[PDB]
Copies of this chain bind each other. A is one copy, B any other.
Amino acid sequence: GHMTPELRAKLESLGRDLTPEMLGGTTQIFAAMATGSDPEVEVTRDLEYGEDPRHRLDLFRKADTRDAPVLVFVHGGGFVMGDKRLAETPFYDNIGVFAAQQGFVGVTITYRLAPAHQFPSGPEDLAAVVRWLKANVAQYGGDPDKIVLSGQSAGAAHVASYIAHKAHHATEGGGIAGAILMSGIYDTLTATPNEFLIAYYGDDPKGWGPASSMAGLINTEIPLMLTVSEFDPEDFQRQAAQFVCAWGMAHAAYPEMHYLVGHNHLSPAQSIGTEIKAIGRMVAGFVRRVTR
């Protein structure tokens, strides 16, 4: 809203391999464009949702925010790294600040990292977040029955795992109004094995089956919005296409999977709070649809 041919051309030239040149080059472009703060957005840092040192969340709101939708964002980083805050950048305060500006309560989290903590640490941590919100978010102007979980890459894998595996649900049915899954990995059995997946799901890919989210995503009643990027690496594109295939086969219907022209793996979430409005709008529009 609107990305130029020129920006598209630059992301294309960074390529569709997840390399340091690509990730870093992307972050550098969007870091200079995204709003990371707003004096009207109050930020409470490092609320503790569990005992682990990484069981922390930052909460974003305006003074007038009441009875509001709650948008949680779960960062990526291949399960082994990343943060809610990257210093000297506006990420991911951008998403928190955007949420607050849109009339929501914004929430960004960290979670326990692989390989020290392996599956199902992810959905455990999300369950603890949901629990914390249920008990506390009313105090910050949130409605605890209007929680929307969003995540990117590994963060989207974690959201998906929470959805799929009712053993980790915080309350009956999951306790969330919807979820947004931006370029995630959903089926551990068809995923191309790599060091990152090995770190989180364990050394032997032949044992990864019970951690698959795909069947649970297909069967869920929780409203889902998903995205895939034009210049996403191969496996992210495959996983997205597989999801659409399985959904269509199960339901004789087409799921809300958005194709993001001009974007790459990192750019969608990093574009929120920039002059490029489309991704922010899509996110906000979905939040309001599923919380009405």
Contact = CB atoms under 8 A, between A and B. Distances in A.
Interface stretch (A83-91, A228-236, A265-273): A228-236
A260 B202 CA distance: 39
Interface string A206-239: 0000000000000000000000101010100110
B238 A252 contact: yes
Nearest to A229: B254
Given A241-B244, A248-B241, A248-B242, A259 B258 contact: yes
A259 B2 CA distance: 18
A245 B257 CA distance: 13
A23 to B, nearest CB: 20
Given A259-B256, A281-B2, A237 B228 contact: no
B259 A232 contact: no
Q: How many copies of the shown chain assemble into the complex?
A: 2
A37 B217 CA distance: 47
Interface residues of A, number: 31
Contacts of A228: 254
A232 to B, nearest CB: 7
A248 B254 contact: no
Contacts of A249: 241
A250 B258 CA distance: 20
A240 interface: yes
A176 to B, nearest CB: 20
A116 interface: no
B281 A254 contact: no
A77 interface: no
Nearest to A278: B278
Interface in A118-152: none
A244 B241 CA distance: 6
A238 B2 CA distance: 30
Nearest to A16: B253
A285 interface: yes
Q: Which 9 A-B pairs have the closest CB atoms?
A: A241-B248, A245-B245, A237-B254, A244-B244, A241-B254, A228-B254, A237-B253, A240-B254, A241-B244
Interface of A: 2, 5, 228, 230, 232, 234, 237-238, 240-242, 244-245, 247-249, 252-259, 261, 281-282, 285, 288-289, 292
